[PDB]
Design a binder for these strands. Structure first.
Ligand SMILES: [Zn+2]
Lengths: 149, 132, 95, 102, 132, 44, 189
RNA sequence: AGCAUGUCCUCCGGGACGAUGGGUACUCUGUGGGGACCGCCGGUGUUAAAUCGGAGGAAGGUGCGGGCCACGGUAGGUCAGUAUGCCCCGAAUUUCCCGGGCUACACGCGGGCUACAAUGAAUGGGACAAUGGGUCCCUCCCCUGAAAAGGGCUGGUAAUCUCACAAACCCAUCCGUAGUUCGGAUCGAGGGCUGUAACUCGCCCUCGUGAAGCUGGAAUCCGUAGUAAUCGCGUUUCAAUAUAGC
């Protein structure tokens, strides 16, 4: 199969980020340049493509982890919160950032609305399988003993 | 060789790049300086020592502007008394307004004025073994 | 001199002056008041000599000028009221 | 298919298993389709307290660990069968729960 | 036909539902190809008994894994013990059992148990506070 | 039942150091005394 | 079968011969695919006699307070130090390490014996397991001291320590500590 | 865990689905049971009581950790958990709220939480742990904001459901050389929910000042295997606040 799991997550997530960058429906909305990745970290992100890569990562997380609510996404997107001389709780992510990313994902049609979050839509699953076949095309010569032999 | 540069009478780290060069100046630290870098249209990671003076002039003008490239929930002087608006000082004016806001309270006999004039904690944490 | 010049501050609204004040005072006034501060407000709006007895209350816009008396463990103390102290707490001046 | 569910969770599991065998023998007498005795997790409720009443005294804590033995069994539904199950002499050490799912 | 055992000695928690079968040779180790096995840093610890079995054996073999939990290193050795047991359950020799016992058992129970139930009087199971 | 120490434990009239845990509402000494009579036991 | 095991899949410990003949029977050149055997040092004592030496050197590198529970970073530093020793000092790298251990392991130690009616420690021979332990301890100390507060990485300083104590470089901390302890043993013969 | 379905890969078993039909094939299972007694064998001790590797064996010879722990003293703590003798208070030392105080601080001392590397700041990756809570309280998803959080609405009398992400971690990697992005105590504006009330006297949140400081002498201290150490986790003091105990 051309599943995503036959390829490393880095190349596939970067491919999904590039395909979302090609799509105009995903954009960094206004407050991307003055808010951090959530509440845990110290500073806003320094990478240029943080919003598209974050949406692609949320897509891959929804695919490999099923339907995920926004607060489950916030819990996944926490961090080692610095308190100075306090015992370093891991709190949450950000509600508005995750919600805007998820709304962009569903407007792109990859995420499917469900009661316990938003499971990934079937079309997104098929297109990401095709992208896995593309990235697996980059390493199709690894194991020749896989077609019907 | 731009080994060291000066901006608005405050010779910042000319060696250090744009994103951290403005943290050394009062009024901006870490978060709001990268907002200035976003507004001025200059990549922070580029070395300031290899920056010709025209772009440095644009950076100086942009940091002089500041408030038009900063949000409204990240200002140190929100709801500043009779002014009412939100401001963000720079230089000696923050300490000047702080000391006047403390000594007028001390004249008016407010509690925070006494706690500032006596060298005590104003937030009320226990003074048992602090500042010995 | 909070939000505007000092002259019109006495005639400002309760919620507008509360928005002039920080979140703590705004929520303190937002969830109603107990009987004691209502009595203090009523007597201030009458004009008799007043011993407030509450060390946490918020100075009002038109309440300024007249002197407030506060119980300080030991019995009472008389304290002046100024434009600088409006919106503050009554116990901030008699430790 | 219709089942009548039995929920018990108590302090003494010996009489619990005895009541389970009594219901099983009642089902085999009445020919009721039965699910076997299923050992559920036991609630190990714990609450400790420092032993020392007075001020001085080193670490002394008597921990009160308590096991609440849970058991879930499923059997069929029938009026005479349910009356037979309701007339069983079950001990006080367990609580008897029923869910008539049809 | 298919081997399903998760007993591995249970390093803390293991949860390794073994699934070893025989087919064309396409081996999918827990929904992951062996060529690009996703854990990577821990697969060196996990590929020991399979390496001892031989490329021809596991190329002949076909294995899947169903999991629930466990710590990362507890997974990394309990799953290896489970794979060793699945190797010996399939029709094979006792030479592989000798080689598996030769290096460091990986068919036994982890003698060091989960934890030790730290008593009141200190932070840890055996450690205590500092006495002046 | 919402307060700092207004509620008292059973038997022992007291406003501090009461076990409100598990809906017991006993002081630690009193609950320690009567746990062996109320079905509690130090099994470990 | 034994599929010709090499350290990190690169360095086979079979084609290495020990110099210190006493330490050969204690330091183990047994082939293991990964240096995470997770030894069993509670059934008896000297359970490390059958355990690998790369694992032991990686777990004696967690001397620091933050290093506890960090066998992954210790193995990372071990691998990059092996790469550095193989590059700048081209040779069998585990052979270089075993030369370093045999050169910086304390042959003699001084122990208190109250004979002659005087409080004086006597100079005694050192056990092979004890000597190997002290060699690994001093190697860890040199690596930690160079790697602390420095522009050079942890694994780089470990490679410097291994090169110093392997090629008999007199500047290494392990060599100087071994010579110091042997000098103190000579002082109390 | 095969039996079969609900959508894609087409190179072809299926990958995903255990919701389900189904199967409890093999397992986790929690009630009853066996196991490993220095029992046999080779040393010692005496031929006794007792003592080492041999066992292909889950633990060989307290398997491994725990509670209960006597006769008595230490006139040790317990009138401040409880009852109680006597002296006393019997309109106060009884008795109910208001305000302050126990937080006040030249200050000596005890124990804890954070800190100076390539063993470190951003961005991802993988599922990860249990103990134990929650129905008068945790929170499902939806909407709103930057945050804390607000509304609505869903699951839970709890192997259902949720607090619930574990962090530490590791890597294409990004990341930089110095006592500074490694390192954060004070204080100034600002927004929060908790409470009947936040100045004394709270915690949450956001911004700007980023300081003191740079592995610490005398002295000590804990600890022998999944234990020290470490990284974070529930629970108890329930209105918040745990750098705390457990
Ligand atoms: Zn009581």
């Amino acid at each position: 199969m051309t599943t995503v799991f036959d390829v490393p997550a880095t190349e596939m997530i970067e491919k999904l980020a590039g395909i979302l960058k090609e799509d105009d429906k995903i954009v960094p909305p206004e407050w991307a340049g003055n808010v951090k990745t959530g509440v845990h970290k110290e500073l806003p992100p320094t990478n240029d493509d943080w919003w598209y890569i974050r949406c692609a990562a949320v897509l891959r997380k929804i695919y490999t982890d099923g339907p995920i609510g926004i607060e489950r996404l916030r819990s996944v997107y926490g961090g080692k919160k610095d308190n100075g001389s306090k015992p370093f709780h891991k709190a949450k992510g950000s509600g508005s950032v995750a919600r805007k990313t998820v709304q962009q994902l569903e407007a792109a049609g990859f995420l499917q609305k469900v009661k316990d979050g938003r499971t990934v839509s079937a079309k997104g699953r098929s297109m990401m399988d095709n992208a896995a076949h593309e990235l697996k095309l980059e390493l199709l010569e690894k194991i020749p003993e896989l077609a019907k032999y | 060789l731009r080994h060291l540069v000066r901006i608005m009478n405050t010779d910042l780290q000319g060696a250090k790049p744009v994103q951290y060069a403005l943290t050394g100046l009062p009024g901006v630290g870490r978060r709001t300086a990268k907002l200035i870098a976003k507004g001025a249209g200059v990549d922070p990671s580029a070395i300031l020592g290899y920056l010709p003076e025209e772009e440095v002039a644009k950076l100086d003008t942009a940091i002089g502007k500041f408030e038009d490239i900063v949000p409204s929930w990240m200002l140190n002087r929100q709801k500043d008394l009779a002014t009412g608006q939100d401001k963000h000082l720079l230089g000696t004016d923050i300490l000047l307004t702080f000391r006047e806001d403390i000594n007028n309270l001390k004249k008016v006999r407010a509690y925070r004025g006494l706690r500032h004039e006596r060298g005590l904690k104003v937030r009320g944490q226990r003074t048992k073994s602090t500042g010995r | 001199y909070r939000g505007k010049t000092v002259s019109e501050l006495q005639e400002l609204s309760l919620e507008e002056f509360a928005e002039l004040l920080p979140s703590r005072e705004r929520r303190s006034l937002k969830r109603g008041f107990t009987d004691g501060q209502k009595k203090v407000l009523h007597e201030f709006k009458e004009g008799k000599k007043i011993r407030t007895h509450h060390r946490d209350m918020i100075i009002l816009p038109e309440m300024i000028g007249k002197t407030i008396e506060i119980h300080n463990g030991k019995g009472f103390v008389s304290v002046d009221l100024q434009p600088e102290m409006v919106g503050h707490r009554f116990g901030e001046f008699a430790p | 298919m219709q089942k009548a569910r039995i929920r018990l969770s108590g302090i003494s599991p010996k009489d619990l298993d005895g009541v389970c065998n009594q219901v099983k023998s009642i089902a085999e007498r009445t020919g009721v389709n039965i699910s076997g005795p299923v050992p559920l997790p036991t609630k190990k409720l714990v609450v400790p307290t420092r032993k020392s009443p007075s001020g001085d005294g080193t670490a002394t804590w008597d921990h009160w660990e308590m096991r609440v033995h849970k058991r879930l069994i499923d059997i069929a539904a029938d009026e005479r069968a349910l009356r037979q199950l309701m007339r069983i002499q079950v001990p006080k050490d367990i609580n008897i729960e029923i869910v008539l799912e049809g | 036909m298919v081997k399903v055992v998760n007993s591995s000695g249970k390093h803390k928690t293991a949860t390794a539902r073994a699934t070893v079968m025989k087919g064309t040779g396409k081996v999918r180790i827990n929904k992951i190809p062996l060529e690009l096995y996703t854990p990577e840093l821990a697969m060196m610890k996990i590929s020991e008994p399979l390496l001892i079995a031989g490329n021809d054996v596991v190329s002949g073999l076909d294995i899947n894994v169903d999991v629930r939990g466990g710590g990362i290193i507890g997974q990394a050795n309990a799953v290896r013990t489970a794979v060793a047991r699945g190797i010996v359950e399939w029709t094979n020799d006792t030479a592989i059992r000798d080689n598996f016992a030769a290096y460091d058992r990986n068919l036994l129970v982890s003698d060091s148990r989960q934890k030790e139930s730290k008593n009141f009087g200190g932070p840890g199971a055996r450690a205590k506070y500092q006495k002046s | 039942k919402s307060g700092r120490g207004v509620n008292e434990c059973k038997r022992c009239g007291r406003k501090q150091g009461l076990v409100r845990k598990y809906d017991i509402y006993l002081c630690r000494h009193c609950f320690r005394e009567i746990a062996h009579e109320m079905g509690f036991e130090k099994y470990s | 079968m034994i599929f010709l095991y090499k350290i990190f899949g690169k360095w086979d410990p079979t084609e290495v011969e020990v110099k210190d003949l006493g330490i050969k029977r204690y330091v183990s050149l047994t082939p293991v695919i990964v240096p995470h055997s997770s030894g069993k040092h509670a059934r008896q004592q000297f359970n490390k006699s059958e355990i690998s030496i790369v694992e032991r050197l990686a777990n004696n590198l967690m001397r620091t307070e933050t290093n506890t529970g960090k066998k992954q970073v210790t193995l990372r530093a071990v691998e990059e130090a092996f790469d550095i020793v193989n590059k700048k000092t081209k040779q069998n790298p585990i052979q270089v390490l075993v030369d370093a251990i045999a050169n910086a392991g304390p042959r003699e130690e001084v122990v208190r014996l109250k004979y002659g009616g005087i409080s004086v420690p006597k100079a005694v021979d050192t056990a092979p397991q004890r000597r190997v332990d002290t060699a690994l301890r001093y190697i860890s100390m040199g690596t930690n001291a160079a790697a602390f507060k420095s522009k050079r990485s942890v694994a780089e300083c470990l490679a410097t320590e291994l090169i110093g104590a392997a090629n008999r470089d007199t500047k290494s901390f392990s060599i100087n500590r071994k010579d110091a302890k042997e000098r103190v043993a000579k002082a109390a013969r």
